[PDB]
Ligand binder design. Structure first.
Ligand code: ADP
Ligand code: MG
Length: 296
């Protein structure tokens, strides 16, 4: 299962708040989809359809209501990927990492709720995480040679010398996230940011085990400037997973790292973040056309 949401951020103060060129239709019930058009100027109107479209008023909290169900998969042993795609400036970091509100803090919080509750059935759970950044195919550890190693048999993935932080408490979580320059911003906007949560549960009373990975990914900006190569290769991978045939995971680090959370029963959701601004009509269109191939 692969789902695609689109999110339009509100206009910024230093920009022009004219959003006449984007129009979003109501959620089509009997076809499970939401449409939008973009008026390109010269009256050439381009249609798009996604699984859900979030307008400028929609908040991080509202957005999590429509993601929560996917997160709950990792308790049934599914692997999960949530990607944020779109141009630098469109709100990827804000969507994934906004304090308290973003997909990452919200996900972590949501998972604890379920852990608290499942303890009543004798499930006990270990939660650990890793937080990495990939730039020009170099892995940097944001909790500090880093090599990827897969275990064919157990279908698991390891990155060498990465600090894995054990999430023991809501206090322990809060420290890690509270912890999370001009050059630095340019740098991270050309990088993927991956937050990996591992969920391990055992239930002595039944004997049952469970594992779940959640990969919360904040991608390199999609505008044209290697970053280009890994975005295309992600596109090709996901589309081909949607269509039994051969998938070149190894063609880029990002897809090679995430391969076991993209094959099989794995569930994926992509956020296409778009800017509402006039100057960015073209980059918005590329983002939408990309999101369509990934979805269609
Ligand atoms: N949904 C939103 N609501 C309010 N402000 C937003 C939203 N999305 C983005 N912003 C603001 O717009 C700017 C760009 O967001 P950011 O997340 O840094 O973009 P990106 O990571 O996609 O390059 C930031 O200043 C951010 O606070
Ligand atoms: Mg960013």
């Amino acid at each position: 299962n692969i789902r695609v949401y689109c999110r339009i951020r509100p206009p910024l103060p230093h920009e022009d708040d004219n959003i006449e060129h984007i129009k979003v239709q109501p959620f089509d019930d009997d076809n499970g989809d939401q449409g939008m058009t973009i008026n390109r100027g010269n009256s050439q109107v381009i249609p798009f359809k996604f699984d859900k479209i979030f307008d400028q008023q929609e908040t991080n909290d509202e957005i999590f209501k429509e993601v929560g169900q996917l997160i709950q998969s990792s308790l049934d042993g599914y692997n999960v990927c949530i990607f944020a795609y779109g141009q630098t400036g469109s709100g990827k970091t804000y969507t994934m990492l906004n304090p308290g509100d973003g997909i990452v803090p919200a996900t972590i919080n949501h998972i604890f709720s379920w852990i608290d509750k499942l303890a009543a059935r004798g499930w006990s759970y270990k939660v650990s995480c890793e937080f990495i950044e990939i730039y020009n195919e170099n892995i940097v550890d944001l909790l500090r040679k880093h090599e990827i190693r897969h275990d064919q048999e157990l279908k698991t993935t390891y990155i060498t010398n990465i600090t894995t932080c054990v999430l023991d408490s809501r206090d322990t979580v809060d420290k890690v996230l509270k912890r999370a320059s001009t050059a630095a911003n340019e740098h991270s906007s050309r990088s993927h940011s991956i937050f990996i949560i591992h969920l391990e549960g055992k239930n002595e009373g039944t004997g049952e085990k469970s594992q779940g990975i959640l990969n919360l990914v904040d991608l390199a900006g999609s505008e044209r400037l290697s970053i280009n190569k890994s975005l295309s290769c992600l596109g090709d991978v996901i589309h081909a997973l949607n269509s039994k045939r051969h998938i070149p995971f190894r063609n880029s680090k990002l897809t090679y790292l995430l391969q076991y959370s993209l094959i099989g029963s794995s569930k994926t959701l992509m956020f296409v973040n778009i800017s509402p601004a006039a100057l960015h009509l073209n980059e918005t269109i590329n983002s939408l056309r990309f999101a369509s191939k990934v979805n269609n």
